[PDB]
Design a protein around this ligand. Sequence first.
Ligand code: TYM
Ligand code: TRP
Ligand code: CL
Ligand code: CL
Ligand code: CL
Ligand code: CL
Ligand code: CL
Ligand code: CL
Ligand code: CL
Ligand code: CL
Ligand code: CL
Lengths: 378, 388
Amino acid sequence: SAKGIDYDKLIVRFGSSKIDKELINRIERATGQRPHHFLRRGIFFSHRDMNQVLDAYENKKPFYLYTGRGPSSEAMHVGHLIPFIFTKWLQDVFNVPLVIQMTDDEKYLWKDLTLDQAYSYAVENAKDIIACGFDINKTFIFSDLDYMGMSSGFYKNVVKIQKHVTFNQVKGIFGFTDSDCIGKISFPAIQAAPSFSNSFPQIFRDRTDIQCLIPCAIDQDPYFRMTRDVAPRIGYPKPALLHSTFFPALQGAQTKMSASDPNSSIFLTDTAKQIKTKVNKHAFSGGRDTIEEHRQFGGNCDVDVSFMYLTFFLEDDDKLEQIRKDYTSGAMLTGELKKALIEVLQPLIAEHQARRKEVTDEIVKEFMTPRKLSFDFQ
Amino acid sequence: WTVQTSSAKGIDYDKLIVRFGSSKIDKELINRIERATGQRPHHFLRRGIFFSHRDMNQVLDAYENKKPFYLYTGRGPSSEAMHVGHLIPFIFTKWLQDVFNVPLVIQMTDDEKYLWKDLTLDQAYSYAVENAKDIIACGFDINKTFIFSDLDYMGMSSGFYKNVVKIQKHVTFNQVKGIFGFTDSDCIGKISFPAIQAAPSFSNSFPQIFRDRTDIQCLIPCAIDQDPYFRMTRDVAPRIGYPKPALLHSTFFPALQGAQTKMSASDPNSSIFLTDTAKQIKTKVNKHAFSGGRDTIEEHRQFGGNCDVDVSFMYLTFFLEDDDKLEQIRKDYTSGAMLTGELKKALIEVLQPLIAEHQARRKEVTDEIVKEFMTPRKLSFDFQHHHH
Ligand SMILES: Nc1ncnc2c1ncn2[C@@H]1O[C@H](COP(=O)(O)OC(=O)[C@@H](N)Cc2c[nH]c3ccccc23)[C@@H](O)[C@H]1O
Ligand SMILES: N[C@@H](Cc1c[nH]c2ccccc12)C(=O)O
Ligand SMILES: [Cl-]
Ligand SMILES: [Cl-]
Ligand SMILES: [Cl-]
Ligand SMILES: [Cl-]
Ligand SMILES: [Cl-]
Ligand SMILES: [Cl-]
Ligand SMILES: [Cl-]
Ligand SMILES: [Cl-]
Ligand SMILES: [Cl-]
């Protein structure tokens, strides 16, 4: 479907629960802040135990944030930023510590990479993540390869989890086969491990009762569905989830943007010209065949990739609505909608590149150094 | 354990060597060890207890060309209960360390036991520490040996987990399915554990001790039941740029009721535990050690005893140091001149001081000592690793 995938159905067959006006109102109530547009516009549409997190936050109880990034390469696209942009907002609004897993071991196992390459992509991607604005005093960005060997609790949990997840379970959840290397088969435990606070003793005082909130693209849910199942089996609380939709590929919402097909992506390193070019020449249009027909029948926002992008990056709700109405009425031609998006993306990407340029190795190193964060858990 | 576990003579090891594709330790190899070490080869070697190997000549070539090599063996801490059989590989390894003068690495697989058994991480780990005491009691040099818990070292090593992952990358579920008989129903922890046992075969898993060196020859002494793990390790090694580990296989220490089984810590009276009192040792031998003697004393004087099925005699071949006395007991038992009671009495006079001495040495292992042994650190050996 050109309308993108059916998320309402995805929620159902996934067992998650939808983020309704009720939950969005509570989030605004508890925080006293207007909810981020990702929630208002349905971009972050699903969740698991978000009310629990809210209860905890409601009663001054602690909780922490956790997301990850598979460093497949030094090239990242705007799609990759969505969950991070949101996680950064969550960190500022709730003012909690954040844990960001860089699965360099995952990509070593799955791709034709060297340990050093994989590790090197984590460090490089971390600069982009730091460019999103995370507070150096409230966030630990770690590489699985490095951290496994310098944590008195990370591996211990990986093992616990490994004892409670069978090969059948992962064949059924992730689709592994008898031909997959043992590394792949047991990897899910690595990604599940950061859901438990005692995986990070340096930041949590050996405590294991701290609520964990995991914001992520819906495609990561199977790992945490599995995590939540074992949490009780090993005496730990279930991590909560906040699911986001996929950022659409240029060719159409039928697919999500993917570094695999570079033609469907707008990279964080693309020049202003390349951005303009990819949008004009490749962004699927919900507009009409001829401009005459466009003026007459108007465009279809529900399948127009450029409009969808504005939904993610145009913050002003009024300007977005105006644009929706004028495109739907024909008052605006896809060429203008296109130009409107381009004027939003170019600065968004240029600014990001400017931020990235500021994060030095000394800075990346501190972010990645296991340490006590400016929080007290006693 | 597959063929011969029915015969009273125990497993057929020469037929096991062919199956496993290993090499038999013959007189040439034994004499080469003697010439290379300037020592009389340990009796386990002289008597065929350590009968098989893989690349031992490679280790010897390296040693003779002044190249270095290190030792690697391990223990699965199923419980605090260790028996006489568990000492065999350690006693031999301790001899290998003194004789060749090389660093030693000993893996305590608490994670393996946590995976396979009904234990808590703290239990498994404490078993590692306790067992570590008995192992230290075998006389290992604290300046030449590093004993580590898996649960501990994994989380404090810059090279261990990396090698485990490299190994995990080159071993398929199918591969371990056909080697260890794993199945779709096992936990993922087990499926991949073989990589944990494989990892210490490579020197860069111990950066502190070998200074990031990646080419140091490794010798693994163990009971043949551990070979599968290393047939696998030897396979992946080249695939990941590392040298293959050499091996020295030992036979199984017999269970009291017969060489049909292997002495297992599960059967309290199938073994002579290191904690047993003099009286308990005496009792176990006389009452439970399968006899190769004849049904009646008359048949015995006429047709003599059978040393190939007699458990007490098998134990003597493992612990009676004096070759001549062992032969005399063998000759006399076979001729029927000696009764099983007398043979039994000889073994008891050997086992009691042995176990007594071990229990006494183990009492000398203070908390601080076990800690230093398990603390990653540079050992009394230097390795040069130059590069720009
Ligand atoms: N009946 C017997 N007769 C003689 N020696 C025996 C007997 N039963 C056990 N052993 C030796 O004891 C050590 C521990 O083996 P476990 O199976 O307890 O422990 C285990 O489960 C191993 N996977 C632990 C391990 C980890 N890495 C290693 C490297 C080499 C040898 C062993 C290991 C071993 O040295 C073993 O050869
Ligand atoms: N496995 C994810 C990265 C990741 C690890 N942990 C996470 C937690 C939340 C979101 C993503 C992650 C990927 O391949 O991209
Ligand atoms: Cl609603
Ligand atoms: Cl309400
Ligand atoms: Cl690839
Ligand atoms: Cl010979
Ligand atoms: Cl033999
Ligand atoms: Cl058990
Ligand atoms: Cl490799
Ligand atoms: Cl008589
Ligand atoms: Cl140098």
